[PDB]
C-alpha cells in the first residue's frame, strides 16, 4: 500500500507541488528488522525523474535527519523545531528522492532484536538494503525499471558502492541501477588517511609534529576502527584542533 | 543565514508527536527512545568494513556504470586530498584534466574527467555540500543525472 | 560586507586633486602620470633579490630582536605552507607547539612558538590579513608589540 | 618642518581623534630620489606608543594604497573613490603606523632620474629606506629612542628583514628598533615554492600532473625570477585556477 504512506502534510510545513511518502518496510523478519524511508517526488513537470537513493553515514546516522533535513531534502526545520521552511536548492526539483534510515536502529528505523545494535556491520547493512528496495519497489511498482541511482556521503561512501554491487550483481530486472554518486566519502583507507593528514597540516590545523605522529601512527589502520597509536595520536590533533567545525573549517560551531 | 544549530531544531521537531504522526513513524509508539540523529551505540560498535572500496569501483567501472565522486573542498572530515589520492589509486586514465567549472559567471569547484568516472570538488563546501553550498550543490547533481561533465564558464 | 574592488575606489579618491593637495602631495604636479596602486613597471625590472632571508633570521635572532612571522591561511599567493616549510628550515627549536588562539570564544588561527620566534597563522584570512581579518588581525598586532604569546580561550 | 607635513583634514574623511602627517624625504639627492610617507598617529590616550614602519610589496606596490586604504590603515575609500570611512580596526588604534611608498617610483614616491624605475632592486630599495628613515626622524625628533618595529607583507618578506638588518648593524642610537613582523612573505624561495605548491594542491586548485610539473620546473628558481619552465608551468596552473582571487581563496573577485 504506497497509497498509505502518503504524507499528507507535515506540521508546519509549507505547500509544495510535490508528493511525498513515508513509512517502513521490514527487512528482517526473522530478526523483527524494520527500515524507515521518506520519498520526496519531484513535480509533474519533471516527471518521470529518476529514482535517487540517498543514504547518509555515521555510521549510525540517519538521512532523515541530515540528508532530508539538512541537506538536499525538500524542507529545513525551524529552530526549535517549531515548523519547516522549504529548501530552495532541493535535490527533488530535479529527481524523485528517497532517504533510507539505515541500518536498522538508525533514525526510525528499528529492530525487534535488541542485540541487531550491536551487531551492525557493512554485509549485513547491505543485505539488508537489498531487501529494502526489492520489497520497496514491490509496494511502488510504478518505479519499476525507472533509471535509478544511489547515492550518499562520508561513511556511505561504504553503503553505497557496497549496496551498488549487490544489485548490480543481484540481477533484480526491476532495478534499473544506472549509477552511484560519493560525497566526501570514505574509499579506501590508507589513502584516505594519506590525505586526509596532508590536508589538515596544509590547513594550520596541526603542529608538524603531530603530522608526522599521525602519519605513524594510523597508517597501517582502518578509518572507522582506528589503532590504539592511532587514537593517541589523534587526541592531541584534537587539541591542536581547538574549537572548530572540523566538518566546515571556516564557519562558525553551535553556540546553543 | 548559515545556522551551525541545524541538528538542535531537527531533533526538536522530530521528536514531536505530530510529525511522527504525519510521518507514519513510530506509530504504535513502541520505540522507547527519544529520536536521536545518529545512533552512538551503533556508531560505537560497528564490525565488518572493508578496507578499500576500489576493487567494487574497478567491477563497477568494468561494468560500465556512471561513477561520480565529490569533494567539499573545505570539509576537514574525509576531504578533499583523500579522495584525490584515493581515486589517483585506481591509476584511471584522464580524459579532461582538472578544469574549473562555473555556475554562472563564479568557479562552483573543480572537475576530472577519467576514463569511467567523474571527479569534482565544490569550492568552499564543508562536509555536508548541500548545507554549506546549496547552489552548487545542485548544479552537480543535475550534470551528474545528465552523465554531463561540468560545465565550463 | 567584503569588497573586493577597493583598489578600484582607491585609484580613483588618490587620483582626486583635492586629496594630493591635502596629502601635500604631488605638490607641483610634475608626476605625469596617473596615480596607480603598484608600479608595473618597476614590478617588471626588478633586480637583486636574495633567495633567503634567513641568514638574517638568524643573525637578528642572535641579535634578540623580537621576530614575528604571520599567514593568512587561504591565501594562494604566499601560502601557509610556504612559511611553514620557511621558518621549518631555521630549525629553531619549540617552546610551545602549534595551538589554537582565541578572540573571544572563537579560534582566531594558531600560533607555535620558537626560540627566537613567534609563528602565527589567522584563519579564514587571505594575503592581505587586516582586510579580511581586521578584528584578528587588530588582535595579532597587539600581542606582537606587547612580545606576549597569542591567546588560549 | 613637521609641522608643515601636518594634514588637515582629507577630502570626505570623517572626524578623529588622531593625527596624520604625510610628505616627502629625499633619500638620494644625485638622483633627485623622494619617498612619500604616511603617518597615522594613536590617540592622546595610548601614547606614547611605538612608531612602526609598514611596507606593502609588489615589488612595485604602494604602502598607502594597500596598508594605509584597504588594511590597517585609519580608513576605507568609498565607492568611486568618493569619501573616507573609518576602519574600525586600524592599527593606529595602539601605534603610531608611518606607510611608506618605495622604492621611488612607486605610489606617490617620485625620482629624478628616469632610468631609476627600470633599475630598482632589492639593496638599493634598502639603503634607500634607511636614509630615508634616518632622515625621517631628524624632522620627527620626538619620535627618536621611540621603540621601533618593522612590519609588512609578501615582497615586503624581503623589504623588511632586509632593511632591519641595515638599521640593526647601521648602529644608528636614535632608532631604537625592537624588531619585526612579516605577514605571509616570501623567507626563503627554494621552500616556499614547495609549500606553494603542495597548498595549491591541497586546496584542489591545481591538477596531479601540474603539481608535479610545477615543483619539477620552479625550484631551483626564484620568486621573483622565475625560470622559464617555471612560467610555462605556473601559465598550466593558472589555467587551471580559472577566475579566482588567488590572494582569498573562498572569496569574490571585483566585477567592476
Ligand atoms: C516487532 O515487534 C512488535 C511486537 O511484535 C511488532 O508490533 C507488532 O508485531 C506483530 C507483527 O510482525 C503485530 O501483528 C503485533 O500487533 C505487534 N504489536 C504491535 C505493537 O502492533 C512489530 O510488528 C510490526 O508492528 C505492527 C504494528 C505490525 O504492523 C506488524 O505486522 C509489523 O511488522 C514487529 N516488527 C517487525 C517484525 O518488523
Ligand atoms: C627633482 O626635480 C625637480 C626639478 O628640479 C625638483 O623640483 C624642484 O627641484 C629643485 C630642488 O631639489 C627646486 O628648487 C626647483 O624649484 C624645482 N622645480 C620645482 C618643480 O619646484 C625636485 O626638487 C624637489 O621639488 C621642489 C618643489 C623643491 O621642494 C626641491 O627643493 C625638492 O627637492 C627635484 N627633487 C629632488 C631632487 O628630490
Ligand atoms: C515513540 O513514541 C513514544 C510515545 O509517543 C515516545 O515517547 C515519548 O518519549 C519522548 C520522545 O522521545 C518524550 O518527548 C515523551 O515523554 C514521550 N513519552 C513516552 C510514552 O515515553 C518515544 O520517544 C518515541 N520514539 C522515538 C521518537 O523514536
Ligand atoms: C600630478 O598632478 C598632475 C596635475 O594636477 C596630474 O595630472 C592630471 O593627470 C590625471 C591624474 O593622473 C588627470 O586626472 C588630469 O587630466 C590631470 N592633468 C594634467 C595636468 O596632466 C598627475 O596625474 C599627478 N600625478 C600623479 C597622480 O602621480
Ligand atoms: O559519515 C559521516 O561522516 C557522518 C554522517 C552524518 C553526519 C553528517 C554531518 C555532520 C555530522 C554527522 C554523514 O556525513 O552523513
Ligand atoms: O608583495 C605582494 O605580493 C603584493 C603587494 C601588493 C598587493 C597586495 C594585495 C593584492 C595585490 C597586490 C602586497 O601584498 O603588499
Ligand atoms: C553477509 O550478510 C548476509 C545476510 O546477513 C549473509 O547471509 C552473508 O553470508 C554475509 N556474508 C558474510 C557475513 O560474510
Ligand atoms: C647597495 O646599495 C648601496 C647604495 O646604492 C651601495 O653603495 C652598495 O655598494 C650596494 N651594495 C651592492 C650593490 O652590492
Same mark, same amino acid.
Given at each position: 500500500?504506497?497509497?498509505?504512506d502518503?504524507?499528507?502534510?507535515?506540521?508546519?510545513?509549507?505547500?509544495?507541488?510535490f508528493?511525498?511518502?513515508?513509512?517502513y518496510?521490514?527487512?528482517?523478519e526473522?530478526?523483527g528488522?524494520?527500515?524507515?524511508?521518506?520519498?520526496?517526488?519531484?513535480p509533474?513537470?519533471?516527471?518521470?525523474?529518476?529514482?535517487? &537513493?540517498?543514504? !547518509?553515514?555515521?555510521?549510525?546516522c540517519?538521512?532523515?535527519?541530515?540528508?532530508?533535513?539538512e541537506?538536499?531534502?525538500?524542507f529545513?526545520?525551524?529552530?526549535?523545531?517549531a515548523?519547516?521552511?522549504?529548501?530552495?536548492?532541493?535535490?527533488?526539483?530535479?529527481?524523485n528522492?528517497?532517504? &533510507?534510515?539505515?541500518p536498522?536502529?538508525?533514525?526510525?528505523?528499528?529492530? !525487534?532484536?535488541?542485540?541487531?545494535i550491536?551487531?551492525?556491520?557493512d554485509?549485513?547493512? *547491505?543485505?539488508?538494503?537489498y531487501?529494502?528496495?526489492?520489497?520497496?519497489?514491490?509496494?511502488?511498482?510504478?518505479?519499476?525499471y525507472? +533509471?535509478?541511482?544511489? *547515492?550518499?556521503?562520508?561513511?556511505?561512501?561504504h553503503?553505497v558502492?557496497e &549496496?551498488?554491487?549487490?544489485?548490480?550483481?543481484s540481477?533484480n530486472?526491476?532495478? !534499473?541501477?544506472?549509477?552511484?554518486?560519493?560525497?566526501?566519502?570514505?574509499?579506501d583507507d590508507?589513502?584516505?588517511?594519506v590525505?586526509?593528514?596532508?590536508?589538515?597540516?596544509?590547513?594550520?590545523?596541526?603542529? +608538524?609534529?603531530?603530522?608526522?605522529?599521525?602519519?605513524?601512527? %594510523?597508517?597501517?589502520?582502518?578509518?572507522?576502527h582506528?589503532?590504539?597509536? %592511532? +587514537?593517541?595520536a589523534?587526541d592531541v590533533?584534537?587539541?591542536?584542533?581547538?574549537?572548530?567545525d572540523?566538518?566546515?573549517?571556516?564557519?562558525?560551531? %553551535?553556540?546553543? | 543565514?548559515?545556522?551551525?544549530?541545524?541538528?538542535?531544531?531537527?531533533?526538536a521537531?522530530?521528536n514531536?508527536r505530530?510529525?511522527?504522526?504525519?510521518?507514519?513513524? #513510530?506509530?504504535?509508539?513502541?520505540? #522507547?527512545?527519544?529520536?536521536? @540523529?545518529?545512533?552512538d551505540?551503533? #556508531? @560505537?560498535?560497528?564490525?565488518?568494513?572493508?578496507?578499500?572500496?576500489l576493487? /567494487?569501483?574497478r567491477?563497477? /567501472?568494468?561494468?560500465?556504470?556512471? /561513477?561520480?565522486?565529490? =569533494?567539499?573542498?573545505?570539509?576537514?572530515?574525509?576531504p578533499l586530498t583523500?579522495?584525490?589520492?584515493? /581515486?589517483?589509486?585506481?591509476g584511471?586514465p584522464?580524459?579532461?584534466?582538472?578544469?574549473?567549472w562555473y555556475?554562472?559567471?563564479?568557479?562552483?569547484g573543480?572537475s576530472?574527467?577519467?576514463?569511467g568516472? @567523474?571527479?569534482? =570538488?565544490?569550492?568552499?563546501?564543508?562536509?555536508e555540500?548541500?548545507?554549506?553550498?546549496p547552489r552548487?550543490?545542485?548544479?552537480?547533481?543535475?550534470?551528474?543525472?545528465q552523465?554531463?561533465?561540468?560545465?565550463?564558464?
Amino acid at each position: 500500500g504506497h497509497a498509505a504512506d502518503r504524507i499528507a502534510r507535515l506540521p508546519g510545513q509549507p505547500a509544495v507541488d510535490f508528493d511525498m511518502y513515508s513509512g517502513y518496510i521490514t527487512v528482517d523478519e526473522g530478526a523483527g528488522r524494520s527500515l524507515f524511508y521518506l520519498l520526496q517526488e519531484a513535480p509533474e513537470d519533471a516527471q518521470p525523474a529518476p529514482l535517487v &537513493l540517498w543514504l !547518509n553515514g555515521g555510521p549510525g546516522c540517519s538521512s532523515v535527519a541530515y540528508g532530508a533535513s539538512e541537506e538536499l531534502g525538500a524542507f529545513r526545520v525551524k529552530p526549535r523545531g517549531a515548523g519547516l521552511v522549504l529548501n530552495e536548492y532541493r535535490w527533488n526539483k530535479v529527481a524523485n528522492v528517497l532517504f &533510507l534510515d539505515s541500518p536498522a536502529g538508525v533514525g526510525f528505523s528499528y529492530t !525487534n532484536t535488541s542485540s541487531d545494535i550491536y551487531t551492525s556491520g557493512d554485509n549485513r547493512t *547491505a543485505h539488508d538494503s537489498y531487501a529494502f528496495l526489492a520489497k520497496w519497489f514491490e509496494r511502488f511498482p510504478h518505479y519499476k525499471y525507472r +533509471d535509478f541511482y544511489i *547515492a550518499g556521503e562520508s561513511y556511505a561512501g561504504h553503503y553505497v558502492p557496497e &549496496l551498488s554491487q549487490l544489485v548490480h550483481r543481484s540481477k533484480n530486472p526491476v532495478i !534499473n541501477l544506472k549509477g552511484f554518486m560519493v560525497g566526501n566519502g570514505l574509499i579506501d583507507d590508507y589513502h584516505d588517511y594519506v590525505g586526509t593528514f596532508e590536508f589538515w597540516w596544509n590547513h594550520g590545523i596541526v603542529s +608538524d609534529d603531530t603530522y608526522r605522529r599521525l602519519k605513524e601512527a %594510523c597508517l597501517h589502520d582502518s578509518f572507522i576502527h582506528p589503532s590504539p597509536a %592511532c +587514537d593517541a595520536a589523534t587526541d592531541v590533533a584534537t587539541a591542536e584542533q581547538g574549537n572548530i567545525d572540523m566538518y566546515s573549517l571556516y564557519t562558525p560551531v %553551535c553556540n546553543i | 543565514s548559515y545556522d551551525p544549530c541545524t541538528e538542535r531544531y531537527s531533533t526538536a521537531y522530530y521528536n514531536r508527536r505530530d510529525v511522527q504522526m504525519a510521518l507514519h513513524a #513510530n506509530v504504535t509508539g513502541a520505540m #522507547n527512545y527519544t529520536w536521536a @540523529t545518529c545512533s552512538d551505540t551503533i #556508531n @560505537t560498535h560497528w564490525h565488518d568494513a572493508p578496507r578499500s572500496m576500489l576493487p /567494487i569501483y574497478r567491477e563497477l /567501472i568494468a561494468a560500465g556504470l556512471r /561513477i561520480w565522486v565529490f =569533494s567539499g573542498d573545505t570539509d576537514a572530515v574525509v576531504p578533499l586530498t583523500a579522495t584525490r589520492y584515493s /581515486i589517483g589509486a585506481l591509476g584511471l586514465p584522464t580524459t579532461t584534466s582538472w578544469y574549473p567549472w562555473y555556475d554562472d559567471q563564479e568557479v562552483g569547484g573543480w572537475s576530472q574527467v577519467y576514463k569511467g568516472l @567523474t571527479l569534482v =570538488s565544490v569550492r568552499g563546501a564543508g562536509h555536508e555540500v548541500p548545507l554549506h553550498r546549496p547552489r552548487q550543490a545542485l548544479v552537480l547533481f543535475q550534470y551528474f543525472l545528465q552523465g554531463k561533465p561540468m560545465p565550463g564558464q
